[PDB]
Amino acid sequence: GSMADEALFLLLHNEMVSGVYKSAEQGEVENGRCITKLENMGFRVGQGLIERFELDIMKFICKDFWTTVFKKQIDNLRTNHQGIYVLQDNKFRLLTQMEHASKYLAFTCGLIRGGLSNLGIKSIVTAEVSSMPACKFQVMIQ
Template structure:
């Protein structure tokens, strides 16, 4: 019994949030286990269950490896995601159109809301402000605590990769960084190189 109707596939939102939360923890464990296997003493004794990074410190070699892995996973997701979201859309005319599409359509697809604020210097730098970043709203945190901000920072690496993957698949070379100073708000900065549509 064949049908010409397309099956709408959906994923439970809470599963996606759980997956993204656990992905960071899994990457930290993987990098730590790799270092222990190689005999790096800075990670403690592999038999006592202790050691390893207790927090996510900037500049830490372990966290650089975690950042790279999470960003690359996000990059691959972004490359595939934009194919699905933009398949019935006309080609973008310039970089600003692409960023506006990300702020409206992509953010709506991913987080059920549009970006709260978009700023640009019209020289290839775009700042996307989300005042209620969905993946942070259910995390327990002290809004103004520097420790809370430091702990949630790795959870921004995956969406940075998604944004970079989207832009890459549209032929735009970019660097994407994110920061947060007051939770659950966060800011994504996209720097686009001169080559692009």
């Protein structure tokens, strides 16, 4: 049912994170490589999802794209300035089992960046836990 459907990505993400950290070579946690691994995997998956489907583009990230991955829409899309958006998820699926949380946000930052890349957009995407398990993703167009 929906409960199992809503767990599938969390379970797979948990394996990705655990395995990247467990399998890290000497110095790769400390030098940021575990992070780039997670962001780069997210990028490829984001690209791939797009292949199966500026403000209009961002609402699609917030709605159809978020719903595919997380079974719900983004709670709030805000943009204060040309080229920078804040996407707020009030109960971020991947944190529902809890600086040390950043590793659980990296893959998703990549997902958003990859989806945008294949729509012709260069971006930087960062994230922070607002109040566990709420999260804000900051999308910065380049």
